[PDB]
Structures are given as structure tokens and as C-alpha cells.
Amino acid sequence: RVEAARNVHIVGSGDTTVVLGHGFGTDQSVWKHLVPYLVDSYRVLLYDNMGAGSTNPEYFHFERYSTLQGYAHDLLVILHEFNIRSCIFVGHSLSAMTGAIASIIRPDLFQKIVMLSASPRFLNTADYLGGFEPADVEQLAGAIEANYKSWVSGFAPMVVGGDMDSVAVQEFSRTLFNMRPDIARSVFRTIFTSDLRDYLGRVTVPCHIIQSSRDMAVPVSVAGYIHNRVGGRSVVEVMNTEGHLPQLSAPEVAIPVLLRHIKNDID
Ligand SMILES: Cc1c2ccocc-2oc1=O
Ligand code: NA
Ligand code: NA
Ligand code: NA
């Protein structure tokens, strides 16, 4: 059941639905410090993607999940099946891009996109700074197929930032361990070999572009890159936070920023 893989969950109520997408290695629980502050005003729809929960027996890695375009298509199917009208889409990490891709096809279904820790491409070119040289990609991949357990122990603190002991690193490690290792590797490869830069000018719905100032995976210049290239309205806010999952690791800072961008129009 594709429904089992997505694990769509709804909470809250209101005239507007907020759809929350998550990044690689985590799941919808990454939004645990945001949801309490939305449910009074919004219906909230959460879903799992990018291989999350694939240690569940009922999980099957459908063919559509071979590409980020397939995830974008699947998001559109979710919006259809849950009768979504003009959602506020909040995408962490690559789900910002699957949301953006989807919004080019059904802009009528998106009131806005709020991007958190988004990047259209991690690998550098001669002319584009994504934050990774080839050596960096190969070193981050590390033991992902040799020894999944070892890989997680190194990957999780690097991505989350701060220090290995933090609850956020523990949480990210927990969700990584709810991924089947083969799926983690294939999705990791999909992501690092995807290049979404060409889509940006086709995006027309308003984009609120939020990131940590100190994110190992997303140089500060990436927020500006997106801002300069999208085809509709946009705004940038770079937070004084570290790490790729600041909604989990620095909620005291990140949650009020997210709420302001959810609740208020540009501009
Ligand atoms: C694969 C991958 C990542 C690796 C490191 O940092 C953030 C990432 O987000 C992703 O989707
Ligand atoms: Na697949
Ligand atoms: Na379906
Ligand atoms: Na608004």
C-alpha cells in the first residue's frame, strides 16, 4: 500500500491546510515542536517520504520513489486524495524542492511554499556553490552500504550539528534506523545526483526561504540563489542557528520564524 509508505496524518482544524514535508533521514516527527502552534488555526497534514519508515513490514519502495520527480508526483496524489484546496506547504530540505516541483504543475493548490534548509543542488560546479566538492560527497557517503550502523553514528551529528549527545542527534539517529539500509543508500544517491536548479524560474507561488546561517549542507548563499531565481514573490530569512534540522535542534529560534512566515503574506 502506497498509503502505508506515506503515512499521512492529520491534526488540527481550520479553513487552510498546512502540509508539512520532511527531509532525508528524518520523518514527520521532525515537526514535533511546530505542530502544537498550528493546530488552533490550521488543519495540518503530515506525511513521510524519502524512504522514512521503510523498516516497517508494510512499507514497499514503489517505483515512483526512484526520483525526486516521482516524489513530487506522489505529493500531488496526496493533495488530491485529501481534498486539499490552497495549502501552505512547508518543506524541510529536499521536500521543499519536491513541493516546488509539484507547485509548477498545480500552482492552484499552493497558497505559498515555506522552505526550510532547502537547496536545489548540493554538488558544486565551477559556477555554483552547493557546499560539496566530489571528495565531500564521497566522504559523507562513507560506510552507508559497508556498515549502516557506523555510517549513522557519523552522519547524524554532522548533519544536525551541535554535539553527538543532543536529543536532536539522538532523534535523527532513531529515524535513520527506521530506514532499510538499501533504501537509505538509493535515496541518498538520488538526492546527491539530482539537480533542480532549472526548475526555479518556473515556480510562481510565493516562496519564503528560511535556513540556518551555519548549516553544513546549505551555504548561506543558497537562500539568496533561490530568491534570485524563482518566478514569483519571495523573501529570505537566515536564522542565527546551526544545523540542517533547526526546527528540531533550535526550536526556540526556528519555531517563531516559521510561524511568522506561515501566518503572514509577502508582504
Ligand atoms: C542526502 C541529504 C543530505 C546529506 C547531508 O545533509 C543534508 C542532506 O539532505 C539530504 O537530502
Ligand atoms: Na523505487
Ligand atoms: Na494513491
Ligand atoms: Na500568508
Residue numbers in the entry: 3 to 269
Please share text taken word for word from the publication where this structure appeared.
To determine why ShKAI2iB exhibited a different binding specificity from KAI2 and D14s, we solved crystal structures of apo ShKAI2iB at 2.0-Å resolution and ShKAI2iB-KAR1 complex at 1.2-Å resolution. In the complex structure of ShKAI2iB-KAR1, KAR1 was embedded completely in the cavity, with the oxygen-bearing edge facing down, and thus, the carbonyl group of KAR1 pointing toward the bottom of the cavity. Carbonyl oxygen of KAR1 in the ShKAI2iB-KAR1 structure was able to form hydrogen bond with the hydroxyl group of Ser95 through a water molecule. This water molecule also formed hydrogen bonds with main-chain amide nitrogen atoms of Phe26 and Leu96, which acts as an oxyanion hole in catalytic activity of α/β hydrolase. On the other hand, the methyl group of KAR1 was embedded in the hydrophobic side consisting of Phe26, Leu142, Phe190, Ile193 and Phe194, and the pyran ring of KAR1 formed face-to-edge aromatic-dipole interactions and hydrophobic interactions with ShKAI2iB. Upon KAR1 binding, Phe194 moved 1 Å away from KAR1 binding site, creating a space to accommodate KAR1. Actually, S95A exhibited almost no heat change following the addition of KAR1 in the ITC experiment, indicating that Ser95 is vital for KAR1 binding, likely by stabilizing a water molecule in the vicinity. As a result of inward shift of helix αD1, the side chain of Leu142 will cause a steric clash with KAR1 if it takes the same orientation as that in the KAI2-KAR1 structure. Unexpectedly, the complexed structure of ShKAI2iB with KAR1 also has a closed cavity, indicating that conformational changes of the cap domain are required to enable KAR1 to access the cavity. In the structure of KAR1-bound ShKAI2iB, the cavity was closed and KAR1 was unable to be exposed to the solvent.
